[PDB]
Amino acid sequence: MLKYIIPTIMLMPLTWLSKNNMIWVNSTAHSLLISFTSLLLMNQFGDNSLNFSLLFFSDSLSTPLLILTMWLLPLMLMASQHHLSKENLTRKKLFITMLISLQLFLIMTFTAMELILFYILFEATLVPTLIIITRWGNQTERLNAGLYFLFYTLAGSLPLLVALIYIQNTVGSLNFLMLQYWVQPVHNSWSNVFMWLACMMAFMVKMPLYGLHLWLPKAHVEAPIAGSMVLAAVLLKLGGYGMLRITLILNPMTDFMAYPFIMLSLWGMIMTSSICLRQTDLKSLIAYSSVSHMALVIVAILIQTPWSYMGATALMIAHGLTSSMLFCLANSNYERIHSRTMILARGLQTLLPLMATWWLLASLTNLALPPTINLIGELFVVMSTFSWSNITIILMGVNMVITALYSLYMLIMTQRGKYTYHINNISPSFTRENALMSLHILPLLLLTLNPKIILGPLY
């Protein structure tokens, strides 16, 4: 993985040694080159994972998440450089450095063989993410958003550390390849019940599980655009990736331990989808939309079927592009009217015809129109949970209806109707913004032609 670690590290001297007016050009250009080389990780085999060294490996689960991570860095750079234009040069370079350091931790997190190494990197992502929100958010309550985000995580992550160290003592190793062969069944006991919860609750908070989700809308409303993009697209999936890995060593106890979380997820997805129908902050609506989509991922992971794991992988990738695109669309309006209130600026299709098309496409993928990979992932989960219990189709189907309702409600409210009379600063869409939207949706739709590369190891 050094061919990705080192050039990512070199982005830092590139940014600091660039001419003052070239920092965005150079960092964007070279981060795109790193993203191109990331496609060499597609050398996956049917039986064995791609095991580079004693520290790093890449299977079909981590590879799509790696590609998404390195694709997202140039997009965040493009999305950030406008609202940071007045920032002084050193603080701009520090901002870009946080984004680069976030990529560094993320690609190492997704490729670590040993689970303590994954833990340290998994925890290290907190620092630049917290700094990005509290330093470069606009509003007063970004400070509280940082503390909620920080302490929700550490409330779950410290028990995980204790469990991980306990598991190594008992088993002798935390190398994930070793765990596949030395794994032993988890028998029933109160000790194993708390081992299970310690192994899982940290990832539940990240997803976030319904009932542990209130940090997320708080974080999004305060974060700058790049913060929301990485948070929605990658940082949530750290918990999804963590669960997909650690469930290996939790059988058969997951059989009955999953129930309360499945109930929270299955009911939570309806609750959060309904909440979206009444949200007045556009960013908060997209944040609640993520909670609803990630509830499906949690169910998929917990029921542990080949179909559910494939759906979970596709849903995680598909949501990452879709939700990141929606924050970018929401942010493009915000950079004109300086408000996140959804009802403030209406009828924008009359004023911004092509941005209306991007809104339309983002909404269509959000409601999982066939054959977008959004639907492929959702459909696979719906398929698998029906076998788990046929009654789940009722909650799955109802959630589909509500998702279509709030997705299109977003579109109708902001883009259709009459334009607000007094808002007279809706300038034409910039090339940067149109490129940013298209750099989300085009790869997302191209993945329809070859979905297999996002379906994960169970494919």
Partner 1 sequence: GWVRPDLGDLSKVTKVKTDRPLPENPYHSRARPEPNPEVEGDLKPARHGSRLFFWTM
Ligand X SMILES: CCCCCCCCCCCCO[C@@H]1O[C@H](CO)[C@@H](O[C@H]2O[C@H](CO)[C@@H](O)[C@H](O)[C@H]2O)[C@H](O)[C@H]1O
Ligand Y SMILES: CCCCCCCCCCCCCCCCCC(=O)OC[C@H](COP(=O)(O)OCCN)OC(=O)CCCCCCCCCCCCCCCCC
For binding to ligand X (CB under 6 A), which residues are involved?
17, 19-20, 188-190, 193, 260
CA 219 – CA 263 distance, rounded (Å): 25
To the nearest whole angstrom, how small is the minimum distance from the Cβ of residue 189 to ligand X? 5
Q: How many CB atoms lie within 10 A of CB 45?
A: 9
> 405-413: which pairs have CB atoms within 8 A and are 24 or more residues apart?
405/277, 406/273, 406/276, 406/277, 406/285, 406/289, 407/289, 407/363, 407/366, 407/367, 408/363, 408/367, 409/277, 410/282, 410/285, 410/342, 410/363, 411/359, 411/360, 411/363, 413/342, 413/343, 413/346
Q: How many CB atoms lie within 10 A of CB 169?
A: 8
Q: Which of 6, 21, 46, 54 binds partner 1 (CB under 8 A)?
A: 54
Number of residues that bind ligand Y (CB under 6 A): 13
Nearer to ligand X, 203 or 406 (CB): 203
Q: Are 5 and 87 in contact (CB under 8 A)?
A: no
Q: Which of 32, 116, 124, 383 binds ligand CDL (CB under 6 A)?
A: 124
Q: For 89-110, b where at least 16 C-beta lie within 10 A, e where not — what string?
A: eeebbbbbbbbbbbbbbbbbbb
Q: Which of residues 187-226 bind ligand Y (CB under 6 A)?
A: 191, 194-195, 197-198, 201, 205
Residue 260 interacting entry, from ligand CDL, ligand Y, ligand X, none, C-beta within 5 to 8 Å by type: ligand X
For residue 457, cis peptide bond before it (omega within 30 degrees of 0): no
Task: Tell me the window of 109-117, 179-187, 319-327, 352-360 that interacts with partner 1 (CB under 8 A).
Answer: 109-117
Spatial neighbors of 422 by CB under 8 A, at least 6 apart, are none
Nearer to ligand Y, 160 or 381 (CB): 160
Nearer to ligand X, 20 or 140 (CB): 20
To the nearest whole angstrom, how small is the minimum distance from the Cβ of residue 112 to partner 1? 7
Nearer to ligand Y, 163 or 356 (CB): 163
Q: Which of 34, 79, 100, 163 binds ligand Y (CB under 6 A)?
A: 163
Nearer to ligand X, 19 or 418 (CB): 19
Taking each helix axis as running N to C, give the angle between helix 126-136 and helix 89-111, from 0 to 180 degrees, rounded to the nearest 10: 150
Nearer to ligand CDL, 120 or 177 (CB): 120
Please report whether residue 177 would count as binding ligand CDL according to CB under 6 A: no
To the nearest whole angstrom, how small is the minimum distance from the Cβ of residue 207 to ligand Y? 13
Report residue 242 as tokens. Answer: 């963590």
Binding site for partner 1 (CB under 8 A): 54-55, 112-114, 116-117, 168, 174
Binding site for ligand Y (CB under 6 A): 155-156, 159, 162-163, 166, 191, 194-195, 197-198, 201, 205
